[PDB]
Design a protein around this ligand. Structure first.
Ligand SMILES: Nc1ncnc2c1ncn2[C@@H]1O[C@H](COP(=O)(O)OP(=O)(O)OP(=O)(O)O)[C@@H](O)[C@H]1O
Ligand SMILES: Nc1ncnc2c1ncn2[C@@H]1O[C@H](COP(=O)(O)OP(=O)(O)OP(=O)(O)O)[C@@H](O)[C@H]1O
Ligand SMILES: OC[C@H]1O[C@H](O[C@H]2O[C@H](CO)[C@@H](O)[C@H](O)[C@H]2O)[C@H](O)[C@@H](O)[C@@H]1O
Ligand SMILES: [Mg+2]
Ligand SMILES: [Mg+2]
Lengths: 285, 362, 273, 435, 362
């Protein structure tokens, strides 16, 4: 038979993956939701009982969270949108090369292995009036870190430069699959160097961007490092992950940190749903 | 335009040799070569692909080489099929035209007429992958029929179709080109398509060309004893011979005829070893007319046992080794050495091994 | 052909400058004495190497670099190997790739790690090996798996189907089609999920910051944060943003090894008639 | 055995002290320092998650002075009056500077014993200033007069939106009476009575006109204490208030060209050295000549007040020790903690340590003044020392009292008092979401 | 063994609808038919791939209709080539040998002898991305020839190869199967290779089979009026008719008066829309003595003006529609009022409409 002889193999094939993924993550998720079901404070343990959705209704009825949300969203939808448009060109230069035999192909990948703290301090020192290789290039007494909009500009640049080797690698690996005869016939059928793209080479890798457009807009949504190490909350610029860090770790307000974690789990799951539904052809289908 | 391929050559870590020749506008040309004989590589080269190594090619009076394939207005149907899997067949046919003059009041009729021509008008919904071979081939051909370029370059365009579809495509592939549109370079080793279509055929082998005549000047007067034994799939069988001008030789026989063709063979110092080159289509069974009204037709065939049927007319495995002769359908023979034949000794291809230029016609 | 060799030699430096000048500024910070760290001047004057001999002080950084160079080369291996099984079973198989396994492996990675740390901490407290590799490896693998699942389930189903058919015809048991048929064609699809897992489990500091106690499994990206130069409230720029230039060596000599299997167009088995 | 935990920032000194009390003292029971991270809040989170699990370890531990007893309000760090009939409350406060015996008591008893203290004090460029200001309203006036020069008019403070902002604002608050919350941990006494409110608005008007000063420019809103220690060292600062580390910092830094415009090229005695990462111990003579060369351009004075020569009651810091309640045996911890803060330990911890130690009469001997020549002032900054606000929860109230003060520029003194008070109230009652 | 297909329906709307036949050991079954009628689908449903909807396959004493294709021991060559684009041709042919029994002393010589057979010895160590089309075809055939398997399945195994090499390859395939090979199904369209190999052919259109007769009883006596217009490549049945048992006319005159089989023809007694269906290989010029060594075989005196001169056997198109007629080379013809066409009235096989069988041979 084949129906039985494929599922009997597939179950024992995916056994270890989902087994390990449920052995050390099911109980933690359950506990993280339990802590949301009821008020809880680590400063006064066992001094609390069930309260319901009070944490949700108080986080949704403030102004300190919509501000940390309209910033993380306004940063994600402008960081990934420029990251894709730059990673396309970077992967093309990384793939159609004649000298890139590890010359550019890895010098475009070392700026992703630099640790996030040691790479955020670099930008924090880079932009300080008086101290910094480029901060002096600005006019006298500029300090683009004290005001809001230049701070957002520098915090999105320190993300573009950091994560460009993450979507300048998938759009290359999933691009070395495009057969040569297809691009060849596109070339001979009256198509230039751009009309080739978006017509014959792009719709092929459509399942290879769904991995670089779905595993970035999660991490670039919970931006915590490059915004905390770099002006961590000046003039209402803190992201939502910094708001889930402050109210949980440095305040011991577990009953609310769990709610603010679940409230972004949901809001990012809606993005994952929209992305899986908008592309059709995807991982399972 | 007049594509003048002056001394073209490719190399490899050797694939074509000096291809010095020309292709005027309007006329066809049909390459043919046994297997891997610089044939699809010649089309890839004359297109924008496969940059040349010798250093000359002139589409028209221009000097078009090392240029972009897009600026040469050449269509193509590869041996393979591009057949963009994500598009449907409507878009696969409309692709090279929609990157041209856009108006949608044109494609709607164009990709319908050029799909009714190839008998596809009912199959304008599926996408490649859901199509069989005889349909992917037709779509690939349509993607270059629909272009109306200044040169058609079809590379084995109809390989796997049926018989009547093939005889209709061979009609509507020249009933289309006859209006105007190309100095087309057809490629096929079919031995009927290179005879019914091309205005000037081209036989080649391992790069070097052999004969560039017309589809009859090769079947009648073939040069270099390879296009001689190549075209006409029941290949002309080759008997040995001696010099002996008047009566040359046979494997079992010496008396021959036709002095009306030795007036130029008079001046020859060719080595006495001679290949006689009798085509099988010229042989008949002596039990029909004894050759002609003249009874004498050299009744010589004796040993034939492998009589393959083939329907319309059968083939005797003639042996005096491993020769073939063809006899008519009603020939009353079934594995029996009663088939004393009659060859026609007024037309045959005398040859020698060294230079084989014994064409000696016209 | 200098035409396509000058454009491609200028657009081969206008990238290796863009993506390098910060990894030159970090070096300039790393190679300056403790008096001129804050005068700009990207090209350092009065260069010295006190910072490297500082970080390498006995048994401080070596036991935290080994505990990472020998845990990354295990999490990568064990997250690609068993993380490729489920991928091959969701791509080239029928039933298991339901909306359940995928809907779970999609929510696993995306859940914020912040609220998840303390349950894992108090779990590993009295369940087993709290402050060593197996206690640190398992969460790394469990949070890297969805990446090595979506990066392989999208490059394991772009192999031409006729290749799988021709593998079936010859009599190749599924343990051999995955070994001699479908693997080497997806070589640019495996060395792109064996690099991302490495870079994820090599420079993260949210788990190993609380789930590690002593020189036994104290990874480099967390023994590089808690440095003390001379005073409590200070940033030892000679030991932070100057140990990165040492932790970046393996992530260089690993990409330089695994960038060979990314070979250009590799498949000629298409319709061809 | 007792395994006291200390921050990784000052840990080698505590290792040497742990040695000198475990192996040098009789063989009673050993001790170690399994340190904890230096995030300064990561440490609190780690200790909290360890004590919550009730893991039978972590006998005695080092906690910052701001975690007075609110760390141990539920019962985390055991009090001293519950000693095994020992000398806990008889030795931890037998005689210790009247300041650091306040930042360990919770309400009416001590829950810890302080090991390290720290007090801010002005550091002014003694070159071009013979009149160190002693009033903030005159402290910025001096810089206003000094605006003639391009950069010496840079008042260098620690006002970034972090603990620095509150630890610099609380000094000015208490320097004119009144407490943030109260003399206890229930109410908010910031603006209740007009007596209290007559001071907050002047504190805000002095922390506004120094950031909007005629010479002060931007980069003052996002300046922590490191910019305040480096502006004076570069050469573009005349007044800057920082902890007492800046004198060793300058005297070991300005040798290597990073000078405050005083030459200090480096005498060929220490210049004749290729000394490793630490540039200390030049047999005290190069140190002597270096300090004597820095004598004329590096002056300090008691913290500049706001009141008419009622000195500004500084906000102290440091590090205290406390026995945890997560140990079924504690007598050994109570016995060892008093051997971990004794004469020799608390002498070394400042003689060849970083943190200014604290003892009854240590600051008044020739055995101490060889390293801290600001001792005559630091022993007075520790008697009338205004501790950071006593609270049953601190980490919450500070990141709101500084969030209200996040944009220092345009604070508009007379307005934001009510907003800051209601913010502190929402922090202290338990309602709201921390920014 | 004995592959007995019984009503193997497949569709996804369609595909092969009703396929019921048997294949004993030894004999070929050469499937033929027009493009998009279902042959590849048949080979797949035989090999297990593309699971059948409502059929009951059988092989030997069992019902292997749902077993894994790996558990059938069936070689195959696809329309496409499915060539492993990284294994050099050596390992690419040796692959099936490296799956069950791997004595390298045997594998190093089996693949060598095989590559010698198919004329691949030179380009033997190379990757199938730098090979030609014909060489890819020959390698895809080599990967299936060297197995000694339980059965064969070939799907146009020689599509793009010169006729010269093609005939040698066909003779070699016949020899190999003569050694031993069971159920060598052979989908092919070249009519010259469906009458020399296949000991039994199956003409099919849109899934349904038409005839399962020997390739002699298929060309001599066709059934269902389609296997007459499909095999015998230049076939022609455009002639109407009007029965008058003694006197029956035609678009040209009296032709059919053949009492030696007219008995069954009149026993038919069917509608008067009958069709005579005269082959082209029997219409001839006015050279041979007409009838059968006689006259009055109805010299047509046709007026057409289209001649195709492929080789020494020309085709005249004659309408006075679109009829065709083979003609010997010696008849000097052109595009004017020309030759009187004589038809031998002994091989007619008259058809009839509205039922379209009129087999007339039983
Ligand atoms: N990528 C390649 N690397 C090396 N040699 C090659 C490559 N491609 C083709 N060749 C050489 O050129 C030949 C192919 O020439 P060409 O393209 O004319 O063949 P073809 O027309 O496809 O062959 P056929 O019609 O006989 O199947 C090969 O046999 C080989 O000798
Ligand atoms: N994947 C598919 N999905 C839907 N319909 C399909 C699919 N593949 C084939 N078909 C249908 O089957 C038809 C062709 O049938 P099949 O593939 O059996 O023909 P074939 O014998 O291989 O063709 P040919 O004789 O031209 O080589 C197509 O016209 C189409 O309608
Ligand atoms: O590698 C640096 C970039 O990736 C970071 O990802 C880290 O933080 C994420 C949540 O914020 C985590 O999901 C992830 O595991 C970490 O590696 C970060 O998202 C980016 O800001 C960095 O540019
Ligand atoms: Mg070819
Ligand atoms: Mg087919």
């Amino acid at each position: 038979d084949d129906k039985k002889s494929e599922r009997r193999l597939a179950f024992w094939l995916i056994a270890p993956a989902v087994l390990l993924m449920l052995a050390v993550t099911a109980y933690p998720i359950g506990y993280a939701v339990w802590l949301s079901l009821q008020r809880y404070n680590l400063a006064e343990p066992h001094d609390t009982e069930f309260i319901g959705l009070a944490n949700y209704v108080t986080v949704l009825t403030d102004g300190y969270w919509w501000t940390a949300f309209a910033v993380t969203l306004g940063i994600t939808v402008v960081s990934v949108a420029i990251e894709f448009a730059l990673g396309l060109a970077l992967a093309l230069v990384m793939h159609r090369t004649i000298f890139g035999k590890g010359a550019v192909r890895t010098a475009i990948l070392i700026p992703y292995g630099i640790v996030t703290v040691a790479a955020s301090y670099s930008w924090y020192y880079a932009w300080t009036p008086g101290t910094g290789y480029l901060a002096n290039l600005l006019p006298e007494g500029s300090a683009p870190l004290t005001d809001q909009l230049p701070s957002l500009a520098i915090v999105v640049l320190a993300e573009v430069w950091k994560t460009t080797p993450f979507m300048a690698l998938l759009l290359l690996a999933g691009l070395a699959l495009v057969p040569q005869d297809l691009l060849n016939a596109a070339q001979v059928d009256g198509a230039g160097p751009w009309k080739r793209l978006t017509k014959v080479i792009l719709p092929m890798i459509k399942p290879a961007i769904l991995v670089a457009l779905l595993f970035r807009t999660l991490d670039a949504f919970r931006i915590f490092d490059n915004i905390y190490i770099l002006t961590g909350g000046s003039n209402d610029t803190g992201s939502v992950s910094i708001l889930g860090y402050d109210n949980l770790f440095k305040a011991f307000n577990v009953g609310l940190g769990s709610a603010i974690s679940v409230l972004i789990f949901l809001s990012v799951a809606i993005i994952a749903f929209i992305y899986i539904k908008i592309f059709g052809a995807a991982a399972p289908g | 335009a007049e594509i003048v391929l002056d001394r073209v050559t490719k190399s490899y870590p050797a694939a074509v040799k000096e291809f010095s020749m020309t292709i005027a506008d309007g006329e066809f040309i049909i390459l043919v070569g046994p297997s891997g004989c610089g044939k699809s590589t010649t089309l890839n080269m004359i297109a924008g692909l496969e940059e040349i190594t010798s250093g000359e090619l002139r589409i028209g009076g221009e000097r078009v080489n090392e240029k972009a394939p897009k600026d040469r207005d050449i269509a193509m149907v590869f041996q393979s099929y591009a057949l963009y899997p994500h598009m449907t067949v409507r878009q696969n046919i409309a692709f090279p035209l929609t990157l041209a003059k856009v108006p949608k009041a044109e494609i709607a009729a164009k990709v319908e007429e050029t799909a009714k021509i190839l008998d596809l008008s009912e199959l304008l919904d599926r996408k490649p992958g859901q199509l069989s071979g005889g349909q992917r081939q037709r779509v690939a051909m349509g993607r270059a029929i629909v272009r109306s370029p200044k040169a058609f370059l079809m590379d084995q365009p109809l390989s796997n179709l049926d018989a009547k579809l093939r005889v209709q495509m061979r009609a509507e592939i020249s009933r289309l080109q006859d209006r105007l549109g190309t100095t087309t370079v057809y490629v096929t080793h079919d031995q009927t398509e290179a005879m019914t279509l091309g205005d000037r055929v081209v036989v080649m082998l391992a790069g070097e060309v052999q004969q560039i005549g017309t589809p009859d000047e090769l079947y009648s007067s073939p040069a270099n004893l390879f296009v001689a034994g190549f075209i006409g799939s029941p290949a002309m069988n080759f008997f040995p011979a001696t010099r002996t001008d008047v009566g040359v030789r046979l494997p079992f026989g010496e008396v021959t005829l036709t002095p009306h063709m030795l007036d130029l063979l008079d001046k020859q110092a060719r080595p006495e070893n001679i290949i006689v080159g009798i085509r099988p289509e010229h042989i008949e069974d002596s039990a029909l007319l004894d050759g002609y009204a003249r009874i004498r037709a050299l009744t010589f065939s004796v040993r034939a046992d492998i009589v393959e049927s083939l329907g319309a007319d059968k083939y005797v495995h003639f042996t005096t080794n491993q020769f073939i002769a063809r006899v008519s359908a009603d020939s009353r023979v079934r594995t029996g050495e009663q088939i004393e034949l009659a060859i026609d000794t007024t037309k045959l291809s005398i040859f020698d091994a060294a230079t084989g230029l014994n064409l000696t016609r016209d | 052909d200098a035409r396509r060799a000058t454009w491609w030699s200028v657009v081969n430096i206008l990238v290796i400058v863009y993506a390098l000048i910060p990894v030159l500024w970090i070096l300039s910070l790393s190679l300056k004495p403790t008096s001129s760290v804050k005068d700009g001047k990207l090209i350092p004057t009065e260069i010295t190497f006190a910072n490297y001999k500082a970080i390498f002080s006995g048994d401080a950084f070596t036991s935290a670099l080994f505990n990472s160079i020998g845990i990354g080369l295990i999490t990568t291996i064990i997250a690609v190997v068993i993380g490729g099984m489920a991928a091959y079973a969701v791509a080239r198989l029928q039933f298991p790739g339901k909306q359940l396994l995928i809907g779970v492996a999609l929510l696993i990675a995306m859940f914020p790690h912040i609220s998840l740390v303390t349950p894992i901490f108090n779990m590993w407290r009295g369940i087993g090996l709290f402050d060593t590799w197996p206690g640190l490896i398992i969460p790394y693998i469990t949070f890297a798996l969805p990446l090595a699942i979506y990066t392989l389930s999208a490059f394991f189903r772009e192999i031409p189907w006729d290749l799988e058919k021709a593998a079936k015809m010859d009599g190749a048991t599924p343990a051999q089609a995955f070994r001699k048929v479908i693997a080497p064609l997806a070589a640019p699809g495996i060395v792109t999920a064996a690099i991302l897992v490495f870079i994820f489990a090599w420079n993260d500091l949210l788990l190993a910051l609380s789930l590690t106690a002593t020189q036994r499994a104290i990874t480099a990206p967390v023994a590089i944060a808690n440095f003390t130069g001379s005073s409590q409230f200070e940033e030892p720029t000679g030991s932070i943003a100057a140990g990165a230039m040492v932790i970046t060596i393996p992530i260089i000599i690993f990409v330089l090894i695994f960038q060979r299997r990314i070979v250009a167009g590799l498949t000629s088995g298409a319709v061809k008639g | 055995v007792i395994n006291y935990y200390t921050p990784a920032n000052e840990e080698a000194t505590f290792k040497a002290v742990a040695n000198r009390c475990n192996e040098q003292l009789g063989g009673r029971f050993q001790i170690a320092q399994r340190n904890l991270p230096k995030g300064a809040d990561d440490q609190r989170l780690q200790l909290a998650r360890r004590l919550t699990g009730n893991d039978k370890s972590l006998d005695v531990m080092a906690l910052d002075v701001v975690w007075t007893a609110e760390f141990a309000e539920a019962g985390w760090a055991v009090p001293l009056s519950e000693d095994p009939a020992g000398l806990a409350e008889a030795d931890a406060t037998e005689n210790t500077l009247p300041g650091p015996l306040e930042t360990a008591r919770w309400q009416d008893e001590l829950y810890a014993a302080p090991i390290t203290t720290n007090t801010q004090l002005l550091w002014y460029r003694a070159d071009l200033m013979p009149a160190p200001p002693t009033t903030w309203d005159g402290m910025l006036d001096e810089a206003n007069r000094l605006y003639r020069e391009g950069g010496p008019s840079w008042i260098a403070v620690q006002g970034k939106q972090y603990e620095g902002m509150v630890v610099w604002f609380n000094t000015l608050l208490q320097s004119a009476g009144g407490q943030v919350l109260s003399d206890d941990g229930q109410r908010v006494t910031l603006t209740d009575t007009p007596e209290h409110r007559a001071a907050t608005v002047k504190a805000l008007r002095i922390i506004k006109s120094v950031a909007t000063a005629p010479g002060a420019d931007p980069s003052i809103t996002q300046t922590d204490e490191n910019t305040a220690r480096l502006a004076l060292e570069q050469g573009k600062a005349a007044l800057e208030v920082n902890w007492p580390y800046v004198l060793p910092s300058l005297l070991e830094n300005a040798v290597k060209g990073g000078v405050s415009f005083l030459p200090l090229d480096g005498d060929p005695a220490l210049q004749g050295s290729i000394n490793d990462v630490g540039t200390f111990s030049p047999t005290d003579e190069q140190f002597d000549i270096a300090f004597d060369a820095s004598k004329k351009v590096f002056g300090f004075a008691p913290y500049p007040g706001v009141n008419p020569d009622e000195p500004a009651r500084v906000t102290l810091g440091g590090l205290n020790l406390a026995v945890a309640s997560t140990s079924q045996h504690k007598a050994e911890a109570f016995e060892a903690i008093r051997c971990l803060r004794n004469v020799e330990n608390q002498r070394y911890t400042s003689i060849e340590g970083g943190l200014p130690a604290v003892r009854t009469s240590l600051y008044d001997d020739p055995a101490f003044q060889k390293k801290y020549p600001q001792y005559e002032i630091i022993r007075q900054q520790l008697t009338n020392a205004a501790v950071r606000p006593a609270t049953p929860v601190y980490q919450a109230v500070s990141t709101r009292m500084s969030a209200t003060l996040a944009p220092i520029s345009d604070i508009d003194p007379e307005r934001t008092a009510d907003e800051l008070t209601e913010a502190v109230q929402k922090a202290i009652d338990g309602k709201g979401l921390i920014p």
